[PDB]
PDB file as gemmi writes it, atoms N, CA and C in Angstrom:
CRYST1    1.000    1.000    1.000  90.00  90.00  90.00 P 1                      
ATOM      1  N   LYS A   1     -17.050 -12.573  17.431  1.00  0.00           N  
ATOM      2  CA  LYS A   1     -17.127 -11.632  16.995  1.00  0.00           C  
ATOM      3  C   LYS A   1     -18.724 -11.185  16.914  1.00  0.00           C  
ATOM      4  N   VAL A   2     -19.621 -12.086  16.480  1.00  0.00           N  
ATOM      5  CA  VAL A   2     -20.955 -12.264  16.724  1.00  0.00           C  
ATOM      6  C   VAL A   2     -21.169 -11.512  17.951  1.00  0.00           C  
ATOM      7  N   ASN A   3     -20.701 -12.161  19.113  1.00  0.00           N  
ATOM      8  CA  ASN A   3     -21.081 -11.896  20.663  1.00  0.00           C  
ATOM      9  C   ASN A   3     -20.403 -10.414  20.677  1.00  0.00           C  
ATOM     10  N   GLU A   4     -19.393  -9.895  20.136  1.00  0.00           N  
ATOM     11  CA  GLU A   4     -19.061  -8.652  20.351  1.00  0.00           C  
ATOM     12  C   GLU A   4     -20.072  -7.392  19.918  1.00  0.00           C  
ATOM     13  N   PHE A   5     -20.554  -8.016  18.538  1.00  0.00           N  
ATOM     14  CA  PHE A   5     -21.674  -6.981  17.909  1.00  0.00           C  
ATOM     15  C   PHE A   5     -22.538  -7.271  18.527  1.00  0.00           C  
ATOM     16  N   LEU A   6     -23.076  -8.438  19.555  1.00  0.00           N  
ATOM     17  CA  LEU A   6     -24.106  -8.711  20.374  1.00  0.00           C  
ATOM     18  C   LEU A   6     -23.849  -7.405  21.714  1.00  0.00           C  
ATOM     19  N   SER A   7     -22.703  -7.421  22.238  1.00  0.00           N  
ATOM     20  CA  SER A   7     -22.491  -6.845  23.152  1.00  0.00           C  
ATOM     21  C   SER A   7     -22.565  -5.188  23.200  1.00  0.00           C  
ATOM     22  N   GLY A   8     -22.047  -4.752  21.714  1.00  0.00           N  
ATOM     23  CA  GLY A   8     -22.709  -3.646  21.469  1.00  0.00           C  
ATOM     24  C   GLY A   8     -23.821  -3.122  21.492  1.00  0.00           C  
ATOM     25  N   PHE A   9     -24.816  -4.236  21.211  1.00  0.00           N  
ATOM     26  CA  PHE A   9     -26.084  -4.161  21.044  1.00  0.00           C  
ATOM     27  C   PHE A   9     -26.851  -4.590  21.993  1.00  0.00           C  
ATOM     28  N   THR A  10     -26.298  -5.138  23.358  1.00  0.00           N  
ATOM     29  CA  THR A  10     -27.071  -5.126  24.346  1.00  0.00           C  
ATOM     30  C   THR A  10     -28.098  -3.785  24.970  1.00  0.00           C  
ATOM     31  N   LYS A  11     -27.387  -2.819  25.002  1.00  0.00           N  
ATOM     32  CA  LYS A  11     -27.570  -1.173  25.026  1.00  0.00           C  
ATOM     33  C   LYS A  11     -28.789  -1.162  24.255  1.00  0.00           C  
ATOM     34  N   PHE A  12     -29.205  -1.768  22.893  1.00  0.00           N  
ATOM     35  CA  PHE A  12     -30.276  -1.754  22.091  1.00  0.00           C  
ATOM     36  C   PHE A  12     -31.442  -2.403  22.521  1.00  0.00           C  
ATOM     37  N   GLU A  13     -30.768  -3.759  22.828  1.00  0.00           N  
ATOM     38  CA  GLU A  13     -31.577  -4.781  23.788  1.00  0.00           C  
ATOM     39  C   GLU A  13     -32.495  -4.205  24.757  1.00  0.00           C  
ATOM     40  N   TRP A  14     -31.919  -3.327  25.178  1.00  0.00           N  
ATOM     41  CA  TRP A  14     -32.567  -2.704  26.352  1.00  0.00           C  
ATOM     42  C   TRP A  14     -34.076  -2.426  25.945  1.00  0.00           C  
ATOM     43  N   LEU A  15     -34.326  -2.398  24.812  1.00  0.00           N  
ATOM     44  CA  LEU A  15     -35.830  -2.196  24.910  1.00  0.00           C  
ATOM     45  C   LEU A  15     -36.682  -3.478  25.297  1.00  0.00           C  
ATOM     46  N   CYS A  16     -35.982  -4.478  25.248  1.00  0.00           N  
ATOM     47  CA  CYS A  16     -37.160  -5.380  25.802  1.00  0.00           C  
ATOM     48  C   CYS A  16     -37.559  -5.706  27.240  1.00  0.00           C  
ATOM     49  N   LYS A  17     -36.633  -5.036  28.117  1.00  0.00           N  
ATOM     50  CA  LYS A  17     -36.960  -4.815  29.567  1.00  0.00           C  
ATOM     51  C   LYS A  17     -37.848  -3.364  29.458  1.00  0.00           C  
ATOM     52  N   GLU A  18     -37.319  -2.695  28.932  1.00  0.00           N  
ATOM     53  CA  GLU A  18     -38.053  -1.025  29.030  1.00  0.00           C  
ATOM     54  C   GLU A  18     -39.451  -1.144  28.346  1.00  0.00           C  
ATOM     55  N   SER A  19     -39.577  -2.258  27.661  1.00  0.00           N  
ATOM     56  CA  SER A  19     -41.244  -2.327  26.981  1.00  0.00           C  
ATOM     57  C   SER A  19     -42.159  -2.651  28.090  1.00  0.00           C  
ATOM     58  N   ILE A  20     -41.983  -3.419  29.123  1.00  0.00           N  
ATOM     59  CA  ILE A  20     -42.709  -3.734  30.329  1.00  0.00           C  
ATOM     60  C   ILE A  20     -43.537  -2.324  30.519  1.00  0.00           C  
ATOM     61  N   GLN A  21     -44.901  -2.496  31.024  1.00  0.00           N  
ATOM     62  CA  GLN A  21     -45.543  -1.250  31.173  1.00  0.00           C  
ATOM     63  C   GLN A  21     -44.956  -0.756  32.751  1.00  0.00           C  
ATOM     64  N   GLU A  22     -44.498  -1.526  33.449  1.00  0.00           N  
ATOM     65  CA  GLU A  22     -44.409  -0.855  34.628  1.00  0.00           C  
ATOM     66  C   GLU A  22     -43.064  -0.032  34.553  1.00  0.00           C  
ATOM     67  N   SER A  23     -41.964   0.029  33.571  1.00  0.00           N  
ATOM     68  CA  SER A  23     -41.122   0.592  33.931  1.00  0.00           C  
ATOM     69  C   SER A  23     -41.694   2.419  33.585  1.00  0.00           C  
ATOM     70  N   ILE A  24     -42.512   2.598  32.408  1.00  0.00           N  
ATOM     71  CA  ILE A  24     -43.027   3.347  31.958  1.00  0.00           C  
ATOM     72  C   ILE A  24     -44.011   4.490  33.112  1.00  0.00           C  
ATOM     73  N   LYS A  25     -44.684   3.201  33.383  1.00  0.00           N  
ATOM     74  CA  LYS A  25     -45.494   3.755  34.991  1.00  0.00           C  
ATOM     75  C   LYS A  25     -44.393   3.989  36.056  1.00  0.00           C  
ATOM     76  N   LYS A  26     -43.713   3.727  36.336  1.00  0.00           N  
ATOM     77  CA  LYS A  26     -43.023   4.009  37.411  1.00  0.00           C  
ATOM     78  C   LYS A  26     -42.273   5.707  36.891  1.00  0.00           C  
ATOM     79  N   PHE A  27     -41.575   5.777  36.044  1.00  0.00           N  
ATOM     80  CA  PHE A  27     -41.318   7.142  35.541  1.00  0.00           C  
ATOM     81  C   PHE A  27     -42.554   8.171  35.136  1.00  0.00           C  
ATOM     82  N   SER A  28     -43.605   7.449  34.952  1.00  0.00           N  
ATOM     83  CA  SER A  28     -44.807   8.422  34.981  1.00  0.00           C  
ATOM     84  C   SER A  28     -45.522   8.901  36.253  1.00  0.00           C  
ATOM     85  N   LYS A  29     -45.270   7.486  37.225  1.00  0.00           N  
ATOM     86  CA  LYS A  29     -45.638   7.934  38.539  1.00  0.00           C  
ATOM     87  C   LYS A  29     -44.494   9.294  39.234  1.00  0.00           C  
ATOM     88  N   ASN A  30     -43.577   9.374  38.492  1.00  0.00           N  
ATOM     89  CA  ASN A  30     -42.582  10.315  38.907  1.00  0.00           C  
ATOM     90  C   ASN A  30     -43.013  11.705  38.513  1.00  0.00           C  
ATOM     91  N   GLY A  31     -44.010  11.952  37.763  1.00  0.00           N  
ATOM     92  CA  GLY A  31     -44.683  13.048  37.264  1.00  0.00           C  
ATOM     93  C   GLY A  31     -43.869  13.959  36.748  1.00  0.00           C  
ATOM     94  N   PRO A  32     -43.319  13.163  35.456  1.00  0.00           N  
ATOM     95  CA  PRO A  32     -42.131  14.225  34.485  1.00  0.00           C  
ATOM     96  C   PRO A  32     -42.750  15.288  34.135  1.00  0.00           C  
ATOM     97  N   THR A  33     -41.720  16.324  33.796  1.00  0.00           N  
ATOM     98  CA  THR A  33     -42.212  17.614  33.097  1.00  0.00           C  
ATOM     99  C   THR A  33     -42.416  17.305  31.479  1.00  0.00           C  
ATOM    100  N   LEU A  34     -43.281  18.349  30.863  1.00  0.00           N  
ATOM    101  CA  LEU A  34     -43.364  18.685  29.499  1.00  0.00           C  
ATOM    102  C   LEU A  34     -41.893  18.345  29.084  1.00  0.00           C  
ATOM    103  N   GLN A  35     -40.810  18.960  29.229  1.00  0.00           N  
ATOM    104  CA  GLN A  35     -39.792  18.724  28.741  1.00  0.00           C  
ATOM    105  C   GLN A  35     -38.904  17.485  29.027  1.00  0.00           C  
ATOM    106  N   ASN A  36     -39.170  16.897  29.939  1.00  0.00           N  
ATOM    107  CA  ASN A  36     -38.828  15.308  30.400  1.00  0.00           C  
ATOM    108  C   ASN A  36     -39.386  14.390  29.172  1.00  0.00           C  
ATOM    109  N   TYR A  37     -40.872  14.483  29.173  1.00  0.00           N  
ATOM    110  CA  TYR A  37     -41.521  13.565  27.962  1.00  0.00           C  
ATOM    111  C   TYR A  37     -40.818  14.154  26.459  1.00  0.00           C  
ATOM    112  N   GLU A  38     -40.654  15.040  26.595  1.00  0.00           N  
ATOM    113  CA  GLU A  38     -40.026  15.306  24.976  1.00  0.00           C  
ATOM    114  C   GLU A  38     -38.662  15.035  25.129  1.00  0.00           C  
ATOM    115  N   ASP A  39     -37.613  15.058  26.515  1.00  0.00           N  
ATOM    116  CA  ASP A  39     -36.537  14.397  26.458  1.00  0.00           C  
ATOM    117  C   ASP A  39     -36.454  12.717  26.307  1.00  0.00           C  
ATOM    118  N   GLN A  40     -37.869  11.839  26.674  1.00  0.00           N  
ATOM    119  CA  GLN A  40     -37.752  10.659  26.377  1.00  0.00           C  
ATOM    120  C   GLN A  40     -38.330  10.117  24.939  1.00  0.00           C  
ATOM    121  N   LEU A  41     -39.063  11.168  24.270  1.00  0.00           N  
ATOM    122  CA  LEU A  41     -39.410  10.984  22.803  1.00  0.00           C  
ATOM    123  C   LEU A  41     -38.079  11.213  22.024  1.00  0.00           C  
ATOM    124  N   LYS A  42     -37.284  12.194  22.354  1.00  0.00           N  
ATOM    125  CA  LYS A  42     -35.866  12.586  21.707  1.00  0.00           C  
ATOM    126  C   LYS A  42     -34.994  11.234  21.909  1.00  0.00           C  
ATOM    127  N   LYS A  43     -34.741  11.036  23.111  1.00  0.00           N  
ATOM    128  CA  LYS A  43     -33.944   9.746  23.286  1.00  0.00           C  
ATOM    129  C   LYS A  43     -34.226   8.329  22.630  1.00  0.00           C  
ATOM    130  N   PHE A  44     -35.689   8.267  22.213  1.00  0.00           N  
ATOM    131  CA  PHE A  44     -36.578   7.324  21.468  1.00  0.00           C  
ATOM    132  C   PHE A  44     -35.977   7.639  20.058  1.00  0.00           C  
ATOM    133  N   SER A  45     -36.286   9.020  19.509  1.00  0.00           N  
ATOM    134  CA  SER A  45     -35.927   9.108  18.209  1.00  0.00           C  
ATOM    135  C   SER A  45     -34.597   8.831  17.896  1.00  0.00           C  
ATOM    136  N   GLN A  46     -33.406   8.982  18.901  1.00  0.00           N  
ATOM    137  CA  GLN A  46     -31.886   8.810  18.579  1.00  0.00           C  
ATOM    138  C   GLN A  46     -31.705   6.943  18.971  1.00  0.00           C  
ATOM    139  N   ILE A  47     -33.014   6.585  19.374  1.00  0.00           N  
ATOM    140  CA  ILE A  47     -32.706   4.830  19.551  1.00  0.00           C  
ATOM    141  C   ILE A  47     -33.100   4.286  18.187  1.00  0.00           C  
ATOM    142  N   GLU A  48     -34.119   5.119  17.520  1.00  0.00           N  
ATOM    143  CA  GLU A  48     -34.242   5.055  15.900  1.00  0.00           C  
ATOM    144  C   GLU A  48     -32.996   5.118  15.204  1.00  0.00           C  
ATOM    145  N   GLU A  49     -32.478   5.990  15.435  1.00  0.00           N  
ATOM    146  CA  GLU A  49     -31.414   6.380  14.537  1.00  0.00           C  
ATOM    147  C   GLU A  49     -30.144   5.280  14.585  1.00  0.00           C  
ATOM    148  N   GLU A  50     -30.191   4.785  15.883  1.00  0.00           N  
ATOM    149  CA  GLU A  50     -29.094   3.354  16.304  1.00  0.00           C  
ATOM    150  C   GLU A  50     -29.848   2.576  15.535  1.00  0.00           C  
ATOM    151  N   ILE A  51     -31.558   1.953  15.505  1.00  0.00           N  
ATOM    152  CA  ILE A  51     -32.079   1.029  14.722  1.00  0.00           C  
ATOM    153  C   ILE A  51     -31.455   0.950  13.182  1.00  0.00           C  
ATOM    154  N   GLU A  52     -31.747   2.113  12.990  1.00  0.00           N  
ATOM    155  CA  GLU A  52     -31.065   2.120  11.152  1.00  0.00           C  
ATOM    156  C   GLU A  52     -29.643   2.057  10.940  1.00  0.00           C  
ATOM    157  N   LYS A  53     -28.842   2.555  12.407  1.00  0.00           N  
ATOM    158  CA  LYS A  53     -27.434   2.332  12.119  1.00  0.00           C  
ATOM    159  C   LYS A  53     -27.428   0.529  12.644  1.00  0.00           C  
ATOM    160  N   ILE A  54     -27.751  -0.252  11.503  1.00  0.00           N  
ATOM    161  CA  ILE A  54     -27.094  -1.629  11.360  1.00  0.00           C  
ATOM    162  C   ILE A  54     -26.304  -1.970  10.427  1.00  0.00           C  
ATOM    163  N   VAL A  55     -25.434  -1.022   9.951  1.00  0.00           N  
ATOM    164  CA  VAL A  55     -24.330  -0.742   9.154  1.00  0.00           C  
ATOM    165  C   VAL A  55     -23.474  -2.075   9.244  1.00  0.00           C  
ATOM    166  N   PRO A  56     -23.225  -2.606  10.483  1.00  0.00           N  
ATOM    167  CA  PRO A  56     -22.457  -4.177  10.233  1.00  0.00           C  
ATOM    168  C   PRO A  56     -22.911  -5.373   9.970  1.00  0.00           C  
ATOM    169  N   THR A  57     -22.821  -5.717   8.899  1.00  0.00           N  
ATOM    170  CA  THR A  57     -23.674  -6.688   8.243  1.00  0.00           C  
ATOM    171  C   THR A  57     -22.536  -7.830   7.488  1.00  0.00           C  
ATOM    172  N   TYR A  58     -21.272  -7.801   8.467  1.00  0.00           N  
ATOM    173  CA  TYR A  58     -20.179  -8.516   7.801  1.00  0.00           C  
ATOM    174  C   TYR A  58     -20.691 -10.161   8.011  1.00  0.00           C  
ATOM    175  N   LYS A  59     -20.280 -10.925   6.681  1.00  0.00           N  
ATOM    176  CA  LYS A  59     -20.533 -12.330   7.041  1.00  0.00           C  
ATOM    177  C   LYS A  59     -19.224 -12.916   7.834  1.00  0.00           C  
ATOM    178  N   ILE A  60     -20.310 -13.462   8.874  1.00  0.00           N  
ATOM    179  CA  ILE A  60     -19.474 -14.043  10.293  1.00  0.00           C  
ATOM    180  C   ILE A  60     -18.763 -15.357  10.086  1.00  0.00           C  
ATOM    181  N   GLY A  61     -17.570 -15.302   9.057  1.00  0.00           N  
ATOM    182  CA  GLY A  61     -16.788 -16.495   8.556  1.00  0.00           C  
ATOM    183  C   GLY A  61     -17.234 -16.495   7.116  1.00  0.00           C  
ATOM    184  N   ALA A  62     -18.018 -17.676   6.972  1.00  0.00           N  
ATOM    185  CA  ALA A  62     -18.797 -18.287   6.106  1.00  0.00           C  
ATOM    186  C   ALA A  62     -20.224 -18.153   5.917  1.00  0.00           C  
ATOM    187  N   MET A  63     -20.759 -16.882   6.904  1.00  0.00           N  
ATOM    188  CA  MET A  63     -22.033 -17.380   7.153  1.00  0.00           C  
ATOM    189  C   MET A  63     -22.513 -15.812   6.827  1.00  0.00           C  
ATOM    190  N   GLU A  64     -23.850 -15.498   5.978  1.00  0.00           N  
ATOM    191  CA  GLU A  64     -24.702 -14.481   5.963  1.00  0.00           C  
ATOM    192  C   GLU A  64     -25.415 -14.146   6.876  1.00  0.00           C  
ATOM    193  N   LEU A  65     -25.660 -12.876   7.684  1.00  0.00           N  
ATOM    194  CA  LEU A  65     -26.681 -12.499   8.743  1.00  0.00           C  
ATOM    195  C   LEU A  65     -27.946 -11.907   8.083  1.00  0.00           C  
ATOM    196  N   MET A  66     -29.135 -12.067   8.864  1.00  0.00           N  
ATOM    197  CA  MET A  66     -30.158 -11.003   8.377  1.00  0.00           C  
ATOM    198  C   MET A  66     -30.527 -10.159   9.358  1.00  0.00           C  
ATOM    199  N   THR A  67     -29.966  -8.778   8.856  1.00  0.00           N  
ATOM    200  CA  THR A  67     -30.122  -7.900   9.691  1.00  0.00           C  
ATOM    201  C   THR A  67     -31.075  -7.166   9.548  1.00  0.00           C  
ATOM    202  N   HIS A  68     -31.921  -7.130   8.503  1.00  0.00           N  
ATOM    203  CA  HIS A  68     -33.338  -6.234   8.610  1.00  0.00           C  
ATOM    204  C   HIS A  68     -34.178  -6.743   9.539  1.00  0.00           C  
ATOM    205  N   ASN A  69     -34.106  -8.381   9.864  1.00  0.00           N  
ATOM    206  CA  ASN A  69     -35.269  -8.835  10.847  1.00  0.00           C  
ATOM    207  C   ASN A  69     -34.670  -7.987  12.086  1.00  0.00           C  
ATOM    208  N   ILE A  70     -33.691  -8.164  12.639  1.00  0.00           N  
ATOM    209  CA  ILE A  70     -33.451  -7.186  13.795  1.00  0.00           C  
ATOM    210  C   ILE A  70     -33.581  -6.117  13.714  1.00  0.00           C  
ATOM    211  N   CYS A  71     -33.412  -5.124  12.480  1.00  0.00           N  
ATOM    212  CA  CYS A  71     -33.695  -3.846  12.479  1.00  0.00           C  
ATOM    213  C   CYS A  71     -35.439  -3.618  12.540  1.00  0.00           C  
ATOM    214  N   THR A  72     -36.139  -4.412  11.945  1.00  0.00           N  
ATOM    215  CA  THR A  72     -37.764  -4.353  12.361  1.00  0.00           C  
ATOM    216  C   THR A  72     -38.371  -5.054  13.846  1.00  0.00           C  
ATOM    217  N   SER A  73     -37.590  -5.602  14.279  1.00  0.00           N  
ATOM    218  CA  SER A  73     -37.621  -5.835  15.826  1.00  0.00           C  
ATOM    219  C   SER A  73     -37.599  -4.814  16.478  1.00  0.00           C  
ATOM    220  N   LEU A  74     -36.588  -4.129  16.151  1.00  0.00           N  
ATOM    221  CA  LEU A  74     -35.877  -2.855  16.974  1.00  0.00           C  
ATOM    222  C   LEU A  74     -36.957  -2.052  16.813  1.00  0.00           C  
ATOM    223  N   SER A  75     -37.620  -1.741  15.679  1.00  0.00           N  
ATOM    224  CA  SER A  75     -38.273  -0.621  15.055  1.00  0.00           C  
ATOM    225  C   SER A  75     -39.811  -0.677  15.875  1.00  0.00           C  
ATOM    226  N   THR A  76     -40.318  -1.790  15.644  1.00  0.00           N  
ATOM    227  CA  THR A  76     -41.616  -2.271  16.318  1.00  0.00           C  
ATOM    228  C   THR A  76     -41.787  -1.964  17.999  1.00  0.00           C  
ATOM    229  N   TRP A  77     -40.538  -2.774  18.593  1.00  0.00           N  
ATOM    230  CA  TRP A  77     -40.146  -2.407  20.237  1.00  0.00           C  
ATOM    231  C   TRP A  77     -40.296  -0.849  20.257  1.00  0.00           C  
ATOM    232  N   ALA A  78     -39.716  -0.128  19.470  1.00  0.00           N  
ATOM    233  CA  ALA A  78     -39.658   1.180  19.746  1.00  0.00           C  
ATOM    234  C   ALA A  78     -40.662   2.020  19.842  1.00  0.00           C  
ATOM    235  N   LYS A  79     -41.971   1.794  18.847  1.00  0.00           N  
ATOM    236  CA  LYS A  79     -42.875   2.315  18.558  1.00  0.00           C  
ATOM    237  C   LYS A  79     -43.950   2.260  19.711  1.00  0.00           C  
ATOM    238  N   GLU A  80     -43.616   0.932  20.452  1.00  0.00           N  
ATOM    239  CA  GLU A  80     -44.270   0.904  21.693  1.00  0.00           C  
ATOM    240  C   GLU A  80     -44.544   2.335  22.586  1.00  0.00           C  
ATOM    241  N   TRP A  81     -43.208   2.706  22.797  1.00  0.00           N  
ATOM    242  CA  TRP A  81     -42.782   3.731  23.682  1.00  0.00           C  
ATOM    243  C   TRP A  81     -43.697   4.789  23.475  1.00  0.00           C  
ATOM    244  N   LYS A  82     -43.389   5.336  22.050  1.00  0.00           N  
ATOM    245  CA  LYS A  82     -44.135   6.479  21.835  1.00  0.00           C  
ATOM    246  C   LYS A  82     -46.035   6.377  21.849  1.00  0.00           C  
ATOM    247  N   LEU A  83     -46.523   5.004  21.292  1.00  0.00           N  
ATOM    248  CA  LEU A  83     -47.807   4.967  22.039  1.00  0.00           C  
ATOM    249  C   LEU A  83     -47.963   5.042  23.529  1.00  0.00           C  
ATOM    250  N   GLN A  84     -47.291   4.570  24.202  1.00  0.00           N  
ATOM    251  CA  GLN A  84     -46.942   5.035  25.730  1.00  0.00           C  
ATOM    252  C   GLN A  84     -47.216   6.149  26.045  1.00  0.00           C  
ATOM    253  N   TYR A  85     -46.488   7.312  25.405  1.00  0.00           N  
ATOM    254  CA  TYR A  85     -46.397   8.480  25.774  1.00  0.00           C  
ATOM    255  C   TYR A  85     -47.531   9.197  25.305  1.00  0.00           C  
ATOM    256  N   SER A  86     -48.284   9.135  23.988  1.00  0.00           N  
ATOM    257  CA  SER A  86     -49.070   9.596  23.715  1.00  0.00           C  
ATOM    258  C   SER A  86     -50.397   9.505  24.604  1.00  0.00           C  
ATOM    259  N   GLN A  87     -50.502   8.121  25.127  1.00  0.00           N  
ATOM    260  CA  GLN A  87     -52.082   7.643  26.033  1.00  0.00           C  
ATOM    261  C   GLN A  87     -51.751   8.416  27.266  1.00  0.00           C  
ATOM    262  N   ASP A  88     -50.560   8.723  27.881  1.00  0.00           N  
ATOM    263  CA  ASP A  88     -50.315   9.064  29.090  1.00  0.00           C  
ATOM    264  C   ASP A  88     -50.452  10.697  29.100  1.00  0.00           C  
ATOM    265  N   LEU A  89     -50.096  11.231  27.710  1.00  0.00           N  
ATOM    266  CA  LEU A  89     -50.038  12.392  27.852  1.00  0.00           C  
ATOM    267  C   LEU A  89     -51.636  12.911  27.480  1.00  0.00           C  
ATOM    268  N   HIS A  90     -52.763  12.130  27.144  1.00  0.00           N  
ATOM    269  CA  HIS A  90     -53.667  12.355  27.181  1.00  0.00           C  
ATOM    270  C   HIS A  90     -54.512  12.186  28.295  1.00  0.00           C  
ATOM    271  N   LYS A  91     -54.110  11.501  29.352  1.00  0.00           N  
ATOM    272  CA  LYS A  91     -54.709  11.706  30.790  1.00  0.00           C  
ATOM    273  C   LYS A  91     -54.070  12.275  31.567  1.00  0.00           C  
ATOM    274  N   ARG A  92     -53.013  12.781  31.416  1.00  0.00           N  
ATOM    275  CA  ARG A  92     -52.524  14.503  32.013  1.00  0.00           C  
ATOM    276  C   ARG A  92     -53.387  15.445  31.807  1.00  0.00           C  
ATOM    277  N   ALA A  93     -53.461  15.518  30.486  1.00  0.00           N  
ATOM    278  CA  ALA A  93     -54.759  16.458  29.916  1.00  0.00           C  
ATOM    279  C   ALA A  93     -55.903  16.333  30.733  1.00  0.00           C  
ATOM    280  N   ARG A  94     -56.278  14.715  30.767  1.00  0.00           N  
ATOM    281  CA  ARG A  94     -57.737  14.980  31.221  1.00  0.00           C  
ATOM    282  C   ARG A  94     -57.500  15.296  32.881  1.00  0.00           C  
ATOM    283  N   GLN A  95     -56.844  14.869  33.565  1.00  0.00           N  
ATOM    284  CA  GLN A  95     -56.753  15.098  35.165  1.00  0.00           C  
ATOM    285  C   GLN A  95     -57.013  16.692  35.454  1.00  0.00           C  
ATOM    286  N   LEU A  96     -55.968  17.364  34.595  1.00  0.00           N  
ATOM    287  CA  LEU A  96     -55.394  18.514  34.835  1.00  0.00           C  
ATOM    288  C   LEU A  96     -56.414  19.842  34.317  1.00  0.00           C  
TER     289      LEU A  96                                                      
END                                                                             
């Protein structure tokens, strides 16, 4: 049951791979539009919505889990991409 939770949450673990700078740099090399940047910010806010959606806290048999730790991890991981987006926005302004 833990692993079922974990499988539902691999999509959220995607943060760990996406946190690499190379992914955001490939997407930035794509030269996306302002609407695209806004779409990533919005998908990011939706990620945050899922981060607060840590409702499952069922005691796994006779074991109680610490979900707030996971939530905090996800939130920090998250914040990474927003700071990345601000820093690339500034250099777009620079070049153009």
